Ligand binder design. Sequence first.
Ligand SMILES: *[C@H](C)[C@H]1/C(=C/c2[nH]c(/C=C3N=C(/C=C4\NC(=O)C(CC)=C4C)C(C)=C\3CCC(=O)O)c(CCC(=O)O)c2C)NC(=O)[C@@H]1C
Ligand SMILES: *[C@H](C)[C@H]1/C(=C/c2[nH]c(/C=C3N=C(/C=C4\NC(=O)C(CC)=C4C)C(C)=C\3CCC(=O)O)c(CCC(=O)O)c2C)NC(=O)[C@@H]1C
Ligand SMILES: *[C@H](C)[C@H]1/C(=C/c2[nH]c(/C=C3N=C(/C=C4\NC(=O)C(CC)=C4C)C(C)=C\3CCC(=O)O)c(CCC(=O)O)c2C)NC(=O)[C@@H]1C
Ligand SMILES: *[C@H](C)[C@H]1/C(=C/c2[nH]c(/C=C3N=C(/C=C4\NC(=O)C(CC)=C4C)C(C)=C\3CCC(=O)O)c(CCC(=O)O)c2C)NC(=O)[C@@H]1C
Ligand SMILES: *[C@H](C)[C@H]1/C(=C/c2[nH]c(/C=C3N=C(/C=C4\NC(=O)C(CC)=C4C)C(C)=C\3CCC(=O)O)c(CCC(=O)O)c2C)NC(=O)[C@@H]1C
Ligand SMILES: *[C@H](C)[C@H]1/C(=C/c2[nH]c(/C=C3N=C(/C=C4\NC(=O)C(CC)=C4C)C(C)=C\3CCC(=O)O)c(CCC(=O)O)c2C)NC(=O)[C@@H]1C
Ligand SMILES: *[C@H](C)[C@H]1/C(=C/c2[nH]c(/C=C3N=C(/C=C4\NC(=O)C(CC)=C4C)C(C)=C\3CCC(=O)O)c(CCC(=O)O)c2C)NC(=O)[C@@H]1C
Ligand SMILES: *[C@H](C)[C@H]1/C(=C/c2[nH]c(/C=C3N=C(/C=C4\NC(=O)C(CC)=C4C)C(C)=C\3CCC(=O)O)c(CCC(=O)O)c2C)NC(=O)[C@@H]1C
Ligand SMILES: *[C@H](C)[C@H]1/C(=C/c2[nH]c(/C=C3N=C(/C=C4\NC(=O)C(CC)=C4C)C(C)=C\3CCC(=O)O)c(CCC(=O)O)c2C)NC(=O)[C@@H]1C
Lengths: 161, 161, 161, 161, 10, 41, 4, 210, 67, 160, 160, 160, 160
Amino acid sequence: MQDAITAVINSADVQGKYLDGAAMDKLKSYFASGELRVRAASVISANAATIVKEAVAKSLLYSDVTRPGGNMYTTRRYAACIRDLDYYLRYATYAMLAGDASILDERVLNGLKETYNSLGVPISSTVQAIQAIKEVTASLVGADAGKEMGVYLDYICSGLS
Amino acid sequence: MQDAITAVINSADVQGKYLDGAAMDKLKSYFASGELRVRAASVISANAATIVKEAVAKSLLYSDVTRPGGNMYTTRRYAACIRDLDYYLRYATYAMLAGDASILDERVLNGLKETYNSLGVPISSTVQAIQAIKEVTASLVGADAGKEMGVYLDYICSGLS
Amino acid sequence: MQDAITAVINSADVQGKYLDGAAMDKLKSYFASGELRVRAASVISANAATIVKEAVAKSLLYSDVTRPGGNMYTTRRYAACIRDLDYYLRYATYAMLAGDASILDERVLNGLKETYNSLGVPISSTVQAIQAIKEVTASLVGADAGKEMGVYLDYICSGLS
Amino acid sequence: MQDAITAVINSADVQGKYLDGAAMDKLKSYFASGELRVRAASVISANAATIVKEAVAKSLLYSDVTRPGGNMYTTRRYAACIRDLDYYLRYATYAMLAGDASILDERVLNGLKETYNSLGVPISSTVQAIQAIKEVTASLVGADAGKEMGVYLDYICSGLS
Amino acid sequence: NEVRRFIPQE
Amino acid sequence: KLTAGNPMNFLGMARSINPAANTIPKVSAQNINIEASVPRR
Amino acid sequence: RRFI
Amino acid sequence: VTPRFVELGQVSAIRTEPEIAYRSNQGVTRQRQQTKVFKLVSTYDKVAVKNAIRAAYRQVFERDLEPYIINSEFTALESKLSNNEINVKEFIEGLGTSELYMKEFYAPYPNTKVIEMGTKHFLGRAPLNQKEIQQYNQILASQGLKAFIGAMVNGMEYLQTFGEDTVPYRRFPTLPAANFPNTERLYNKLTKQDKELVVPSFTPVVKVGG
Amino acid sequence: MRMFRITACVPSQTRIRTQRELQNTYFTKLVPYDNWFREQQRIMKMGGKIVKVELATGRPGTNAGLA
Amino acid sequence: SIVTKSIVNADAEARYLSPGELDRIKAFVTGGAARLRIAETLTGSRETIVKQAGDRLFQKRPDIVSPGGNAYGEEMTATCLRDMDYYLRLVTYGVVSGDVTPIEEIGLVGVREMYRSLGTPIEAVAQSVREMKEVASGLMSSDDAAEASAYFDFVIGKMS
Amino acid sequence: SIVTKSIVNADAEARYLSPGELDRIKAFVTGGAARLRIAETLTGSRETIVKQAGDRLFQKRPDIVSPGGNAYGEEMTATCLRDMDYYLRLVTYGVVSGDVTPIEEIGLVGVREMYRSLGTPIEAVAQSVREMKEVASGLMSSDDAAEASAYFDFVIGKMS
Amino acid sequence: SIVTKSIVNADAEARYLSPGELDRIKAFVTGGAARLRIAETLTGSRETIVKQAGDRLFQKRPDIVSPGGNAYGEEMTATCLRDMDYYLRLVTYGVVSGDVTPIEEIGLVGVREMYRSLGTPIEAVAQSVREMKEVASGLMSSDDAAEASAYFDFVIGKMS
Amino acid sequence: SIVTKSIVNADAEARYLSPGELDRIKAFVTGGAARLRIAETLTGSRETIVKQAGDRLFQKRPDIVSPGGNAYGEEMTATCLRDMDYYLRLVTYGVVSGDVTPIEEIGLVGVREMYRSLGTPIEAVAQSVREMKEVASGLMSSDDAAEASAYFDFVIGKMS
Ligand SMILES: *[C@H](C)[C@H]1/C(=C/c2[nH]c(/C=C3N=C(/C=C4\NC(=O)C(CC)=C4C)C(C)=C\3CCC(=O)O)c(CCC(=O)O)c2C)NC(=O)[C@@H]1C
Ligand SMILES: *[C@H](C)[C@H]1/C(=C/c2[nH]c(/C=C3N=C(/C=C4\NC(=O)C(CC)=C4C)C(C)=C\3CCC(=O)O)c(CCC(=O)O)c2C)NC(=O)[C@@H]1C
Ligand SMILES: *[C@H](C)[C@H]1/C(=C/c2[nH]c(/C=C3N=C(/C=C4\NC(=O)C(CC)=C4C)C(C)=C\3CCC(=O)O)c(CCC(=O)O)c2C)NC(=O)[C@@H]1C
Ligand SMILES: *[C@H](C)[C@H]1/C(=C/c2[nH]c(/C=C3N=C(/C=C4\NC(=O)C(CC)=C4C)C(C)=C\3CCC(=O)O)c(CCC(=O)O)c2C)NC(=O)[C@@H]1C
Ligand SMILES: *[C@H](C)[C@H]1/C(=C/c2[nH]c(/C=C3N=C(/C=C4\NC(=O)C(CC)=C4C)C(C)=C\3CCC(=O)O)c(CCC(=O)O)c2C)NC(=O)[C@@H]1C
Ligand SMILES: *[C@H](C)[C@H]1/C(=C/c2[nH]c(/C=C3N=C(/C=C4\NC(=O)C(CC)=C4C)C(C)=C\3CCC(=O)O)c(CCC(=O)O)c2C)NC(=O)[C@@H]1C
Ligand SMILES: *[C@H](C)[C@H]1/C(=C/c2[nH]c(/C=C3N=C(/C=C4\NC(=O)C(CC)=C4C)C(C)=C\3CCC(=O)O)c(CCC(=O)O)c2C)NC(=O)[C@@H]1C
Ligand SMILES: *[C@H](C)[C@H]1/C(=C/c2[nH]c(/C=C3N=C(/C=C4\NC(=O)C(CC)=C4C)C(C)=C\3CCC(=O)O)c(CCC(=O)O)c2C)NC(=O)[C@@H]1C
Ligand SMILES: *[C@H](C)[C@H]1/C(=C/c2[nH]c(/C=C3N=C(/C=C4\NC(=O)C(CC)=C4C)C(C)=C\3CCC(=O)O)c(CCC(=O)O)c2C)NC(=O)[C@@H]1C
């Protein structure tokens, strides 16, 4: 895992260089964004359950996936689907705070396609659900923070597609 | 895995259907067959060792398979072989009791053809030994039960080739 | 793993025959070199750390491999490369004692390229370090023993490319 | 463990004797009580949660045991205490069905006194609670069944003492 | 009493 | 021809040894008193 | 000991 | 008219048997439910003790031992477990440190594959991450096989999952990422099915130092 | 090898288990000498109380011949 | 199904089913016809069981069907009956199976998470099943009702 | 017995006995008079069962009663027939108890190791039991023979 | 061989061979010609070794060649003598290799399962190995015979 | 980094970052300029920090720069100062990140293996870092020195 700060440090380390003025500019840019990221993260955590509930309502419910024979059908599978959506939102919040998507490549996407394809989880439906999560959280945290969270939720979706 | 009852139940659940007339018929048919299944199962277990012994004697003894250079040569390989035959008889009896071959797909055939090709186990000889097991079991359980075991032992044979 | 003696014994057992003259000569050949192999394994085990240390000093140090951005850079990756060279010398010594590279095939090379490719370990640099292990080892076990050790250190290098 | 049936068998096995008339007259007695035992065991199973609730209410609740400083205080301990009372009623039902307290010796009292002593679980209050379970049980299954259930709850109480 | 053979069954 | 391990290769040896089977024994569970004949070391 |  | 609540539970269009079979077996395998967990709660029942022991052999060695032993080398270990002198955890470690285990799942494979077969047998799962692969690779490189088994079975994860009285069993972990599919690939192969590494190493996302 | 015979009472902290648990709560077991430090640390971290420790096998003070 | 459970248990111990297990399966298949009749009763009266249960439910929990409630309106109310229909259907699966396994595997594992996410008062779902149990009991003999109630009671316990 | 077996299974799941399990017990404790009848038959005719089966075994396996055989001589032949009486006795325990656990715990755990240390060809011991089964069948009605057949077959399967 | 036995032992401890392990490999290679001579003796005299051992065996165990016995009849006797030749060929593998690894992996691993399935009495197979050991130990010097005996005895100990 | 460290701590518990963690992150970003100034100070005076500290080290440990010492000779002496430069740069990474993981992952995991392989006396390396901590501390105010000292002490505490 790598955040915005360690991205600067790693780029200097691979060249064996101390941090110069340009590198300090990048760290300053991230420090200036810190307040925005922290406030958004606290709002999302306090509303995580409701964010997913509304994302599910507008994207999954009353469709083939919830009718008998569907992948979300049965209480276990419905519960697993909500749990997965909780994970995506929680790791996007990590990524948004870190300002770096590498956590998504490492702790979310690694082997995810293989998992879903072996279970028969509908990839398009989960992508539509995450996009619904992106829309819902944007209307909660604002356009600027909504667009920042949109990057990391869109990163997950592009990983799955 | 699924038995005859849960196959009907699960296929009804996938379609969101209460058990209709056709389903009730299938359940009645399995219930009527139940007594003969438990009797055959009790017979096979009492004769499991003797069944495999006779099947090996009549299919895999005094051939090039048991001689040096044959895949049954050496005691460890001979033991592994008759251990394998014991697997097929026991799981074929599970499937007979369940009235459903799914346990064979799940707990017997998964990866078996690959495993035998890796170790050089001759599948042709193996299917012959299973066929011999089919003949020997039929003589002990009867004709009706013998055919039922024949179905599932044949299922294993066809899954090997 | 099979050693030279095992290969002779297995070559005859697979035919189900006693050891004839030709097999006895293969055993005699191995018996002749027993002191050569045992003496070399004694000195190698005495100088294992030294052989790797000087093989690294002569092959990897003060190059871009150990400088920032090189795969040996960072203390963690330095230790990992040292540990790997300890493997290759200890297993090459096993192969030399056994007069047979089966142990290298089974315990070393199986999946090694997959591992290194996933971690980004440079093969060519790894081959240089092993070849340097060979030259250092030869200067310590004499020329005859270093010739036999070279066969099995070359075997690893061949299996890596 | 041993039930009433296997107690008769064991008394004959250790003498190497086939069950004689007197031994059969023991087995007839147990077969004659089978109906009442099975009836009572079904009543308790249906009222199990209710029995402990009522036994707890008249024995533990609103005393120092449940108040701060008492060993039932805190939710963990209250729940653990009810879980233990669930144990006692359920295992005494086993011993009632079998007509033999051996299962109590092997699965209830084996190491219980040492465990309670180390954790500070008060025995006297646990005995008081069990006695309440006995009285509540008696009012629900009858007089003779409650007499037999009382025998096996008294066995635990004296066992704990 | 049976006499077992050492020939492969056909 | 016969290959290695084939029991035919020892048929000649088996006939040469010509092992002597025990005579069909004269035993009868009917005549045996079980409780009296079982050793009591 | 030389690194050159 | 058809009651609305009936229409709200209806399946669109007719479903053919293929669709029915696919939909009936979708999701996590029923093997997660259709199993038995051997938890030795007492040593009075010798039949249960023996059943737990034989399950232990099948878990650690992947099948019954008879066709690849001459005589049993675990008899004293079974005697200790049966006499309540050790626990199931000690019995399980005794199996992993045995010469039989070394022959079966150490000598035929490189230490990289020894790691994943180790976690499969004793933890029920594929290795978590590269840190875990590193941690066990150093143990194998420096102390050998017995140290590796001892590390797994005496770790906090083992005790929290299987405890002292329970035979390990196949797990279906949800987290972390890739643990479920890797564990699935390990447990969907027969013994000696092939000589391939399921988890040779985790491809790093950010190379520290490179 | 040297072995300890240890008695320990390990409570339950974050769950109310419903199966029988006495066997994994208060137990006496043999621990190889080379595992006791690690095992003792683990029991301590799980909240366990080590109630008795004995050197069941081996002798105190041995320098050579530990097996 | 006891048949699946026995095979699972037997294969976990790598053994043939014991004589006791085979006897249980024998008694299970013999009692199949009585189980099937009870299933037919519940299956036949499906629509009236749900409708009357729903009316009883709304009588004693009017909030859930009044404005602001989870089931307020025609569509949401039908969904509530649809859910009740689901659980009645699972009860028939269990009745025929002779076991709660179809009930638990299909409609109870994680049910609490599902209804919490939807904002459905779970204690009212448990009430609805209680209502269906009372209605169904009055459509079958006392013995038949007692056998069917174990499956209704299983659902109710898991919703509490 | 049947009761202990049910309790053990129920205890392994930390639950009260199922109403079905309480049905098998209830039927057993009311059908027991027939079980005692089978035990009386086998007990009363144990001598003829063992001796007729013993003679049948020696017909099929004369070698075991020949010089070099494990039962050669009257002292060993008596001991062989003595072991047959044991296993017949253990079968009456199984029939009366309604379960094989009495049999397995007395005479089948480690039976291979005992007969290995003695030199007895356990296969022949399996043959003797199925000889006693055939002779016992003739002394009993079909239904009685089927009831006792499971406990005979169980012993045979655990010697084979 | 002794080489693979040592290597596997050291590899499991992530270590080089100890001084003692190298010592016995050095001794093994030094005394190689003596082992090849002992192996040469057994191979040349195999026919007389097995026959005279086969003859001795059946005189101690006449039952196995009597009716019902495993080796009853000439054809089964021929199979039994074949098995003796197998285990003779394996003893010569043991001597040349200095380790019982060729014996275990070819003829002892799982052997009890093989002979149990065939009904062959295992203790009688061990006896036939004794007989071959005696016939063999009289065809060579005591020192050579003593080395050969150790490998015969290993089989006798494991089969017994 | 402080952000990564708290994220991995929160992920390990499958939870969102706690208010305490979020407040620590907020303070760190808001005090960001003060830390970068300290890193700028260390970076700019890296030549004199390493040279003076290296000069002091060889006075404190003359053996390492004597015949048979690991740093004997100008070339080995250069590599020792290079290594000190490595560790100083890592300290500046730790300063700006508010966490030691960048130091640990780059230059402390396996450091004992690396230096024992090279023959370097590791405790003298701890001394060299210690010397750099004094020289650096004397180039800044006490409060700034305290912030940098924590990371110097972490390196010292790990190698030593
Ligand atoms: C009626 C007693 C209560 C009630 C019900 C209610 N449910 C929903 C919505 C859903 N219910 C389910 C249920 C299931 N799916 C399954 O797979 C299973 C097992 C087979 C069950 C029980 C689902 C999945 C939904 C989501 C909608 C969909 O089916 O796609 C609602 C509507 C909630 C909303 O806002 O949409 C209602 C009203 N509500 C009450 O208040 C009663 C206590
Ligand atoms: C919801 C939008 C969709 C859906 C979900 C669904 N998922 C599963 C099963 C699993 N989901 C995961 C996912 C992860 N594991 C991880 O570690 C991470 C990284 C953060 C992720 C994303 C896994 C591993 C599984 C399998 C294991 C498990 O379920 O515990 C299911 C099936 C559950 C089942 O028990 O069968 C479902 C239903 N399904 C849909 O239809 C939606 C589109
Ligand atoms: C002779 C001392 C005893 C004896 C022998 C006997 N064996 C068989 C049959 C077989 N024996 C083997 C043995 C081996 N195969 C191997 O690969 C190895 C190691 C290389 C061994 C030892 C096998 C495989 C068989 C099966 C026959 C076949 O070759 O295909 C028999 C005949 C069994 C029958 O009834 O057919 C006999 C008689 N029997 C005794 O009584 C002696 C104590
Ligand atoms: C006997 C009729 C034939 C024969 C058999 C033979 N099999 C093996 C090895 C294995 N067989 C299996 C098969 C299974 N394992 C399972 O768990 C199941 C599912 C229930 C099956 C079907 C496996 C996995 C192995 C390898 C692992 C193991 O042995 O435990 C061998 C040994 C091969 C070797 O090289 O050792 C043999 C000899 N061989 C024949 O010639 C017969 C035709
Ligand atoms: C040294 C010459 C080169 C080098 C090595 C290097 N290797 C790793 C990591 C690993 N190496 C292995 C190797 C093996 N495992 C086995 O079981 C066997 C058979 C004996 C071998 C050879 C493994 C499994 C790993 C991963 C686990 C671990 O690191 O302990 C690294 C680290 C890579 C990383 O970034 O993690 C390195 C540096 N690197 C070079 O540049 C040299 C040319
Ligand atoms: C009030 C919002 C709800 C309510 C409360 C209620 N509680 C009881 C009885 C008890 N409450 C407790 C609780 C605790 N004990 C502890 O140690 C802890 C941790 C601090 C807690 C929370 C206990 C143990 C009891 C038992 C009585 C006793 O203290 O001895 C009652 C009485 C129930 C009865 O029938 O006696 C009530 C009424 N009831 C409601 O309906 C509200 C939702
Ligand atoms: C035989 C001469 C006498 C006899 C023996 C007997 N012993 C037990 C039970 C046990 N014996 C041991 C002993 C050991 N286990 C070991 O691992 C070792 C060290 C290598 C030894 C010495 C143990 C531990 C037990 C208990 C556990 C177990 O069953 O293995 C029994 C069985 C008692 C019972 O009912 O469980 C018996 C019969 N009995 C005699 O009468 C002989 C005089
Ligand atoms: C209730 C009447 C009294 C009470 C109970 C209480 N018990 C515990 C903890 C444990 N209770 C047991 C008992 C058993 N476990 C079993 O498996 C069985 C055999 C079937 C029995 C009888 C055990 C083992 C424990 C410890 C482990 C665990 O809880 O799983 C507690 C909590 C102790 C603590 O401090 O953690 C309590 C409160 N306490 C009273 O005051 C009542 C009089
Ligand atoms: C100086 C205080 C001490 C000292 C130093 C010394 N080091 C070496 C050689 C090397 N040092 C390293 C170190 C690192 N590589 C990394 O990636 C990291 C980043 C954190 C570190 C710290 C390496 C890799 C080498 C090898 C040479 C190379 O750079 O390629 C030497 C030379 C030893 C030799 O014989 O060549 C010396 C002298 N020596 C002392 O005595 C001081 C205590």
